Design a protein around this nucleic acid. Structure first.
Ligand SMILES: [Zn+2]
Ligand SMILES: [Zn+2]
Lengths: 101, 90, 183, 110, 96
RNA sequence: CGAAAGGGUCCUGUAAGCAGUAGAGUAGCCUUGUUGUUACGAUCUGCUGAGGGUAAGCCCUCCUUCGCCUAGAUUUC
């Protein structure tokens, strides 16, 4: 079930994208900037329990561990294993390239 | 120039070279059979209304002799040698 | 001006078409239409939607390795303007387009090679299972052909073949029902 | 040039005639549009529909009318005494593989 | 509908025709903006009654590109050849 | 002029059916495992940007077909 499914596609209800999550997994600096754009005291569990793949904060370590067994986390893992869609893949799909000399 | 050299090389190697009445006959016969199957399914769709009511059993309706003779004729059965007229009730 | 390409589906994006999403990491996403835009906002993967160039490239239905595809690129090092260079470039684009079209047709035929053998095998199986539905002469027609052959001293099999040819030429459909005669 | 008694097979595009019609009226409107089509095609105000044609129209409920339908219209003579019209049309449904891709064709009298 | 910087040889009519009009096969006038009529309607063009006072009337127009994609939808192709080149070979092409 | 059809242009998103050393596993038969094999099995892949729709207020078609036609009635310094 999705909370308030009617307005789910609004920009003010937007969630973090899969390629951003891929860059977060590859580079801790990217994740650090994303976490800097938030306030730690307003986060669940003071921000101590975070799932990078789902880009989600949890209230406790047991909550995070229990979430890992669910199918949404496994869907995110399968999507990351398949690979996020990027501008490089979009360019390769039409056979376009970048000439830098 | 390299593209044109590759093009004439492929044209010499036959890269652009382009290529049975029994197969045509069997394909036409299969198409005829598919058309006959479609007609049979349409007849079944016309006859069946099983969502709302049951089909009247065939034994409760007397089949017309003209229709039976016509159907056996299209099936290729010589009906005069067997005499359906004597078999028809009145 | 220039023709962009859609991020989601790869179609040509001409000016004033579609919409651009500006993401806060500094990345721009150009969409050719609201269809692609709404699929992106629903977080659908273009690689799985079969109507996109991303899916077609992933499935191998687009010509990917080819020499004619190496001529178009995003040129990040500019060249000083030269009229002769621009004119011969235009001639080159025309020639490259023709060659690319020919090679693409060859690629598609290589993809669809085996269809004829598959269809012939299916046709043979269907005919072997349904020989009794092939066109045939009526019993009364066989009677009249037999008596005409007896009268004319001709081959009844021959008259059967030309009668079957006439029946194959004349195609007639059957109408449901029939009028009830009024009293 | 064309005799009074004549039968032709037509494809009726009912989709463009039922576009935007209320759901509880789509199939009766289809019946009336078939009658209007037959009147326009044969010049006869007296049009009679086969019950199998009615079943074909009502096959998928009151709002599930097919987009196209193949029919045979037969202009025939009204032999009853004291008839207002000398001719009438009888419309039947035609068993075909696919109602698409067919032209108007004259049915052989034999 | 060709310009000095767009060398595509094409006419003004969009792909699939103008919606509810047809094809423009005659001389035509391109007017900036919108005009009071609808499609198919007779339009009367008149000389301006007074000498103009704006620099916009003095400006010379330099067109770079004219859109000729279909207005019956989200048309992405200016010409039928462009559509075929992007599309590639279809099933009906080998069927023909 | 009308009704079909064909071509275009748009919309959706890959039809039915068949096949596959694709498929988590399970159960039989025997070479008792060596894709052992056969069977079933969401799904996947191919045939297939396929199938379906397209004016109802989309476009084109003397040269793709079939039909219609110089009326009827009423009134008028
Ligand atoms: Zn998670
Ligand atoms: Zn797009």
């Amino acid at each position: 079930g999705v909370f308030a499914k009617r307005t789910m596609t609004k920009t003010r209800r937007r969630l973090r994208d899969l390629d951003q999550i891929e860059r977060d997994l590859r580079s801790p600096r990217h994740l650090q900037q994303y976490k800097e754009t938030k306030a730690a005291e307003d986060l669940p569990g003071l921000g101590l329990y975070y799932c990078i793949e789902c880009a989600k904060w949890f209230e406790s370590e047991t909550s995070l561990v229990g979430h890992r067994k669910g199918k949404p986390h496994k869907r995110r893992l399968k999507q990351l294993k398949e690979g996020a869609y990027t501008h490089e893949e979009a360019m390769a799909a039409i056979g376009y390239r970048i000439d830098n000399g | 120039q390299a593209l044109e050299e590759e093009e004439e090389r492929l044209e010499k190697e036959g890269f652009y070279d382009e290529d049975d009445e029994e197969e045509e006959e069997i394909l036409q016969k299969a198409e005829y059979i598919r058309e006959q199957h479609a007609l049979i399914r349409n007849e079944a769709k016309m006859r069946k209304s099983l969502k709302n009511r049951a089909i009247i059993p065939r034994k409760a309706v007397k089949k017309p002799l003209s229709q039976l003779e016509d159907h056996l004729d299209q099936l290729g059965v010589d009906t005069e040698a067997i005499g359906l007229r004597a078999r028809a009730q009145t | 001006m220039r023709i962009e390409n859609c991020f989601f589906c790869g179609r040509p994006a001409w000016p004033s078409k579609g919409i651009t999403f500006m993401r806060n990491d500094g990345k721009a996403f150009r969409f050719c239409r609201s269809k692609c835009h709404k699929n992106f906002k629903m977080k659908r993967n273009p690689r799985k939607l079969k109507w996109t160039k991303a899916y077609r490239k992933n499935a191998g239905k687009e010509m990917v390795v080819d020499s004619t595809l190496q001529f178009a690129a995003r040129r990040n090092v500019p060249v000083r303007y030269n009229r002769e260079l621009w004119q011969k470039t235009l001639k080159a684009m025309e020639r490259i387009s023709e060659i690319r079209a020919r090679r693409e047709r060859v690629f598609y035929k290589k993809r669809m090679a085996g269809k004829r053998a598959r269809e012939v095998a299916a046709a043979r199986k269907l005919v072997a299972e349904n020989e009794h539905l092939l066109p045939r002469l009526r019993g009364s027609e066989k009677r009249r052909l037999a008596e005409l052959a007896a009268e004319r001293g001709v081959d009844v099999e021959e008259l059967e073949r030309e009668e079957l040819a006439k029946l194959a030429s004349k195609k007639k459909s059957k109408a449901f029902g029939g009028e009830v005669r009024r009293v | 040039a064309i005799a009074d008694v004549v039968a032709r097979e037509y494809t009726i595009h009912l989709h463009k005639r039922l576009h935007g019609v209320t759901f509880k009226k789509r199939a009766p409107r289809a019946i009336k549009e078939i009658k209007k089509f037959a009147q326009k095609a044969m010049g006869t105000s007296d049009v009679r529909l086969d019950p199998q044609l009615n079943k074909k129209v009502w096959e998928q409920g009151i709002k599930g009318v097919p987009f196209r339908i193949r029919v045979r219209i037969s202009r025939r003579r009204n032999d009853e005494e004291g008839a207002k019209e000398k001719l009438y049309s009888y419309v039947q449904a035609v068993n075909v593989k696919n109602p698409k891709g067919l032209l108007t064709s004259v049915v052989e009298e034999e | 509908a060709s310009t000095e910087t767009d060398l595509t040889k094409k006419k003004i009519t969009p792909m699939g025709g103008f919606v509810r009009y047809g094809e423009v096969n005659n001389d035509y006038v391109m007017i900036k903006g919108s005009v009071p009529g609808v499609k198919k309607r007779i339009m009367t063009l008149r000389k301006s009654l007074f000498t103009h006072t704006s620099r916009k009337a003095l400006e010379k127009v330099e067109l770079k590109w004219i859109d000729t994609s279909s207005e019956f939808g989200h048309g992405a192709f200016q010409t039928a050849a462009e559509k075929k080149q992007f599309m590639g070979t279809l099933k009906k092409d080998l069927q023909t």
